[PDB]
RNA sequence: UAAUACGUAGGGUCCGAGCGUUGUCCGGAAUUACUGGGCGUAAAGAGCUCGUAGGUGGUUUGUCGCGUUGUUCGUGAAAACUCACAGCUUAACUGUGGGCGUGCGGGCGAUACGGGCAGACUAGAGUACUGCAGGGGAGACUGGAAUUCCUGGUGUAGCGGUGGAAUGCGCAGAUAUCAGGAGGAACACCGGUGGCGAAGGCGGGUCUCUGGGCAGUAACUGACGCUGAGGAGCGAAAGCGUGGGGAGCGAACAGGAUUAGAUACCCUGGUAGUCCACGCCGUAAACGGUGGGUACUAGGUGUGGGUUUCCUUCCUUGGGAUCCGUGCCGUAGCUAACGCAUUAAGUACCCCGCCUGGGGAGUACGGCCGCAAGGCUAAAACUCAAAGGAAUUGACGGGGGCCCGCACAAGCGGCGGAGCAUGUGGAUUAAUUCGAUGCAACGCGAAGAACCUUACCUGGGUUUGACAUGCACAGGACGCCGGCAGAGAUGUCGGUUCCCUUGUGGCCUGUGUGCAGGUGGUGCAUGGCUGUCGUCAGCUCGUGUCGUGAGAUGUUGGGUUAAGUCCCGCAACGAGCGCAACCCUUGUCUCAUGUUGCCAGCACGUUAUGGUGGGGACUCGUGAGAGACUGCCGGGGUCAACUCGGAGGAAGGUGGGGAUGACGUCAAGUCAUCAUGCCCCUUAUGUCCAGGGCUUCACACAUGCUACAAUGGCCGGUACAAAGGGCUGCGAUGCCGUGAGGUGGAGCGAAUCCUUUCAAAGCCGGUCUCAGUUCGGAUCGGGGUCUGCAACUCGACCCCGUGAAGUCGGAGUCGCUAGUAAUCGCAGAUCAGCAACGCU
């Protein structure tokens, strides 16, 4: 409890709920159809990385919408894979499944994405440097990435150590209320076990 | 240019008054520190020193290179390692006058016949 | 138990007829430093001087050729080493011919340098003459104050001692006071980065005897000089010997006192000794921790001594210039750096001392000296892998300066005292499941342990399983509804015996194969989550300048702040993560907004009442915006901030409380919320089952409440809050029960309806009249209710009788600065019902 989550903090004010819909009685239910929708979702597909997951409900409709920048990974090209996912949706019965796929416009100034590329990386066999170093160049250079903070942390590099170190740039306030921040929790696996990884992207302010 | 940009297209109390207070502040903190690199660009050539005894600490900032340093001198310092001293008289109002339009006749002059 | 460092596997490197180990010697090792080192602090300058042997030596003329230097002969056996060859199938090996064979004896040539010889010179050196100081020493003599003590006077009951007291001195006449006298050490102010001396060290005064030092002339002699192994002499205080003397002080010693004990610091007394004479020892932080001597090598600066021209009155820190001696600042230069820097730790030669890892040890043995104490020279075995010097960051400090927090102070109520309500410890135990451990745990993981949970124990079944999936082989039905054996698990008859469409499948029967699962271990393998120092004001980066480097700077110093918030002058300029602030709630107002709630202005019901139409006017519930911004006043204030009292306001000087955890430590906690690397179970530490436990208690610790009463106990009567909860449920009125409770269901997914039109303190009337009590309620024996299939371990609740401890709490501690504390009650997440008096 040293640093909760800037989005679960902002979410009152100026980030925005990923499960919209109203109930009184079937709320636990509702609920419980998610996790398991979604559960499901992660256990098919994990080849290419789910940047976001939404869904919504309606009298009879269902709305589930899944942001990834690379589809033609995770789609159906012929409809195979989509279609997949109907099926376990049907399964689990949302009924209508209006299934929204989409793609990203900035990979790397999508939090949870930059995150699962690198942790993928360091999965491989790689080292942590490099892949730090390279993502902060990488999300620099574009426009919209003011500050970040990259924070790796494991048996880093194989060093049988509980270790923290990070590359930072730019300007991250998270204290900034007003300003959109854009938070990525990612564990990834390992030879010698599990690492963590946290990243923080500042964007501007909001003026409303 | 950001400052003074900002202060000219003229978007003050859309922030706070008392930072409108404080941008005066940083301009004019910002001017009686700086005027020369809004014109410079051009990797400066290392010349007119003052006030050696006092800012002794400017020895090691300026001399490093040993393209000319330059001045009148002062009475009584660490004397003749750097390449151009000028003999003279340091405290006088008037004779500052005179050494004033000296360098403006000299410079001037110096212009006119680049 | 997870090793690239152990043994073995494969593999690879190195070498090869050898490969590794051992033993010694050289090198590396500038680690005995002639080539080629050092002594301020790392090991190292004798305690300081005189001086023998010795080493070293100013200028010049002339001379010898001893050194030295040049060539030639003689010599340096041969073999060796190396160059050029020849040959042994090349090479190894052999021979030929050279160079060296590093030095030696004779002659010859040179004389600059060293030396010897014969001189000379005057800069060094000493002397001479005149001045100049000065606690320089030794002896003789002598002075005043002051302390104690003996005589006497006044005189009274304490005096002395400390942080505080008592031993002690007095009460036989103290201390205090005053005159006189006795006495023997040390000399206040002068007196100090201040003079003298080789050094130790030297100051009351006068005399006498003596010594060195500085300056001026530089008349005089003419290199006589410098150092110095040994040696001799000198040498603080303490100690030794003989004699005298002894006021004060004072080790030892004695007593009081603090203390865990105080052989110690404190107090009261006090012996040697300190004092003089004459003989000793010969040590010290005998320290400038820098051996002596001579010269060159920027200055500025006080201050002491003697000469002397300039302004000269010519009386003067006058000023200048020279000589000597002394302290501070400062370049070059040097140094590991610290720091030295004309009084050198730099610049070079002369001489000497001295060092070669620490410890053992400056010890032992032997010797010299010593009356003794003991000093000097001075090792080894053996052992350690470092001992050490200088500076930096951090922390710490019973060192300091400046500051804030209910940290203490102030004022209140508690703990510790009794009763029980729960959570732990320890011990019982067949089982009392596990973890959490001062601050930061103990009404913790729990937000509800009877079975369930539950992980633990007795007893029974299960074993690819309580639930799946990947394979194929044998399946077409599989379940479900009732029956029997049964604590239940579990096995067994009666009824269900499919839809695909010929290829197979939903499905489940088995067989095993992949297995599936763990509350089994490592939270010091990990992630994630969280508490903590700490909501304390800081913690870092860029690029630079400084430093050999660790690192510094910025971020130091003033004003100033809730704070690294801000201002001013500076090797720093700039910035981020923080503190502030846009978030929520409350605090005020303008407009709208009209029910499921108000209801002033109006008309209608009247037993219960806004209850119904009617007004959205005040309230108002929900939303948007202005309002606090030192906003303006004038006196203070680097004129900057920073404040001081104002108006106006609903609020005013971060309105209040909230949310919010800079980098990281405590290897903080959780492998049992969860995730997971590695190790283990598998016929079982898995797993299905009923019973029992987690509530055992001769005790301890902690959290709280209920009490020890008249502000209180009891009956009755009267009015108001906020606030939420609700459907296979909240439950109204009526009546019956003592009362928990009850058929029953009005109305209700709910600003309405159950939620008495919502309460308890409090108010009015009266009794109880200060006591184990009409306080207090434990505790038990019985009469009973609800839910749950089931109230014994083990549930809550009413009623009857029951009536215990407790008469205001110990050393110390805990929480509290305003709508706070103390008190009354309500509501509820979890939950069928409960220990819930907890938590919110």
């Given at each position: 409890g040293?640093?909760?989550?800037?989005?679960?903090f902002?979410?009152?004010?100026t980030?925005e709920?990923?499960?919209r819909?109203?109930?009184?009685?079937?709320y636990?239910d509702?609920?419980?159809?998610?996790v398991?929708?979604?559960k499901?979702?992660?256990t098919?597909?994990?080849?290419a990385?789910?940047?976001?997951?939404?869904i919504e409900?309606?009298?009879?409709?269902v709305?589930?919408?899944?942001?990834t920048?690379?589809?033609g990974?995770?789609?159906?090209?012929?409809?195979?894979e989509?279609?997949?996912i109907?099926?376990?949706?049907e399964?689990?019965?949302?009924?209508?499944?209006q299934?929204?796929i989409l793609?990203?416009?900035?990979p790397?100034?999508q939090?949870?994405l930059?995150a699962?590329?690198?942790?993928?990386?360091?999965?491989?066999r790689v080292?942590?440097?490099r892949?730090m170093?390279?993502?902060?160049?990488?999300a620099?250079?574009q426009?919209?990435?003011?500050?970040?903070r990259?924070?790796?942390?494991g048996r880093?590099?194989?060093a049988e150590?509980?270790?923290?170190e990070?590359?930072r740039?730019?300007?991250?306030?998270?204290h900034?209320?007003?300003?959109?921040?854009?938070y990525?929790?990612?564990?990834?696996?390992?030879?010698?076990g599990?690492?963590?990884?946290?990243?923080?992207?500042?964007?501007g302010?909001?003026?409303? | 240019?950001?400052?003074?940009?900002?202060?000219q297209?003229?978007?003050?109390?859309?922030?706070?008054?008392k930072?409108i207070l404080?941008?005066?502040?940083?301009?004019?903190?910002l001017?009686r520190?700086?005027?020369?690199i809004?014109?410079?660009?051009?990797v400066?050539?290392?010349?007119?020193?003052?006030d050696?005894?006092?800012?002794?600490?400017?020895?090691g900032?300026?001399?490093?290179?040993?393209?000319?340093?330059?001045?009148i001198?002062d009475?009584?310092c660490d004397?003749?390692?750097?390449?151009?001293?000028i003999?003279?008289?340091?405290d006088?109002?008037?004779?500052?006058?005179l050494?004033?339009?000296?360098?403006?006749?000299a410079?001037?002059?110096?212009?006119?016949?680049?």
């Open positions: 040293q640093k909760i989550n800037p989005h679960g902002r979410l009152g004010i980030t709920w990923k499960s819909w109203y109930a009184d009685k079937q636990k509702y609920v419980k159809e998610d398991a929708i979604r499901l979702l992660a098919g597909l994990e080849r990385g789910i940047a976001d997951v939404e409900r309606t009298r009879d409709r709305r589930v919408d899944i942001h920048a690379r589809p990974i995770v789609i159906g090209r012929r409809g195979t989509a279609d997949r109907r099926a376990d949706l399964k689990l019965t949302g009924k209508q499944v299934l929204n793609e990203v416009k900035n790397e100034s939090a949870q930059v699962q590329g690198v942790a993928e990386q360091l999965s491989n080292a942590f440097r892949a170093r390279k993502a902060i160049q990488s620099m250079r426009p919209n990435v003011k500050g970040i990259v924070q790796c942390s880093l590099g194989g150590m509980s270790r923290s990070f590359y740039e730019g300007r991250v306030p998270l900034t209320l007003r300003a959109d921040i854009d990525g929790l990612y564990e990834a696996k390992t030879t010698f599990r690492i963590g990884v946290k990243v923080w992207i500042y964007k302010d909001i003026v409303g | 240019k950001e400052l003074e940009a900002m202060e297209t003229g978007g003050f109390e859309g922030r706070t008054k930072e404080m941008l005066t502040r940083e301009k004019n903190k001017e520190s700086l005027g020369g809004r014109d410079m660009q051009k400066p050539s290392a010349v007119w020193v003052v050696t005894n006092k800012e002794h600490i400017a020895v900032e300026a001399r490093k290179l040993g393209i000319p340093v330059i001045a001198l009475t009584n004397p003749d390692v750097v390449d151009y001293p003999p003279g008289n340091d006088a109002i008037r004779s500052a006058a050494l004033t339009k000296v360098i403006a006749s410079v001037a002059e110096g212009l006119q016949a680049r």
